[PDB]
Amino acid sequence: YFARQISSFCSIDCTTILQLHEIPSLQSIYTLDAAISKVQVSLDEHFSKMASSEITKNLLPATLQLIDTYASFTRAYLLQNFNEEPSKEKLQGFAAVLAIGSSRCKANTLGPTLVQNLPSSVQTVCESWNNINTNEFPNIGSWRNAFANDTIPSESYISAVQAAHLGTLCSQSLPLAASLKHTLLSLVRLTGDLIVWSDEMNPPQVIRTLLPLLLESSTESVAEISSNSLERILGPAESDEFLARVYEKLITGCYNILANHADPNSGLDESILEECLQYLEKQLESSQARKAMEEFFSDSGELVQIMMATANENLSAKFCNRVLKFFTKLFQLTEKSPNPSLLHLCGSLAQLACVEPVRLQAWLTRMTTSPPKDSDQLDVIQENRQLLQLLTTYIVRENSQVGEGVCAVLLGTLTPMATEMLANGDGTGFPELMVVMATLASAGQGAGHLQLHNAAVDWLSRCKKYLSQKNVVEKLNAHVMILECTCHIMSYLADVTNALSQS
């Protein structure tokens, strides 16, 4: 029966949101609960008597897949239930949020906090979902006393399970999956039983199953049971392996919200993003979480994606500010207490050297340009500029692991921005841009700076050109932004010639 159910699930997507129509009718869910109860009781009996090999061999893979599939069904019943007063985009977002949302184990308030930040409607929906439970059903080993049934007990137990399913039918709110939860619970208990005996259990695979089943809100009935399964394979809830999986998954989820749920279409308030950026700084503090994030990001430029996601303009300048601190504290923590994990994140920023130049510029633009029209907080825009300068200085340092390519990449991209700050006469920001460009020639100490020398020669040329406007000349005798830009360019040329004389 398990096989049948699995195969029927071929149309079902394990890692994707299932349409509310693809959730199985209560019938299948309960035929299943029944089959499960039966195998369970029968095997208990057999084992106590013993006090089969291929039996477990087959049952375990078969059960493992159904748990993950029914986990998606529980989510589908909860997610699609969200009241429109919702776009799939919004829904995919709420999804990562409630997934991350863990209500058990060490995990992290990260979830609980993100779960909370999900508007009144969704909050109430999740609340009602958790409020319903698998109570009327007869719970574990009730067959110890033969389930109050003469001789063969299993049948009466299955009948009571069916009666509880029919009572859930009566419910008008989330009635079908009031039984999905109990099916999931029975499945997780049977899976823990199969894990008990070694059989051929795939430790890492089962570990992953239970990790996702736990650090989630939809699958909350078995969250404890999944934690028990992890204690079984990962070890104590305070064992490294267990915590290792918990926090790794947590970061993966946060990251998913940071890069694949940044768009407002996900319906996710900016609060979630800021809260888990704080959570990521917190993990950087915690050595183990720091090192996991480290392997992962020296592996994939994923930290670059955070700043690349910050390029999103829909995100407030507060996001920019928050992102800058995170990296600020990544570089500083490295300076205060150097360790390989930190070396590896700077090797990760070397991947930033290879990014979409337009996207990088679009990001640099959002960071430097200060429009009071949308950003009433120009002071926060200025803090953003300062933190970008700090990050550039950190990358240009000799002991930095970001490499020289990234510095040049940033330097080159800023050149057009600087030119625009002189072409459209954007005096505001131009001086800071110049400062940052300078740090790139700074990286140019032993090797480099050449680029900056040439670029500065060119900027001098351009500021000269503008001032040469005699209308503006008369205005000044009586614009001023362009004049001060030219003055700063001349001062930087003076500094460059001083450096050349020192050489």
Curated annotation (Swiss-Prot):
<protein>
    <recommendedName>
        <fullName>E3 ubiquitin-protein ligase UBR4</fullName>
    </recommendedName>
</protein>
<comment type="function">
    <text>E3 ubiquitin-protein ligase involved in different protein quality control pathways in the cytoplasm. Component of the N-end rule pathway: ubiquitinates proteins bearing specific N-terminal residues that are destabilizing according to the N-end rule, leading to their degradation. Recognizes both type-1 and type-2 N-degrons, containing positively charged amino acids (Arg, Lys and His) and bulky and hydrophobic amino acids, respectively. Does not ubiquitinate proteins that are acetylated at the N-terminus.</text>
</comment>
<feature type="modified residue" description="Phosphoserine">
    <location>
        <position position="298"/>
    </location>
</feature>
<comment type="subunit">
    <text>(Microbial infection) Interacts with protein E7 from papilloma virus HPV-16, HPV-6B and HPV-11.</text>
</comment>
<comment type="similarity">
    <text>Belongs to the UBR4 family.</text>
</comment>
<comment type="subunit">
    <text>Component of the SIFI complex, composed of KCMF1, UBR4 and calmodulin (CALM1, CALM2 or CALM3). Interacts with E2 conjugating enzymes UBE2A and UBE2B. Interacts with RB1.</text>
</comment>
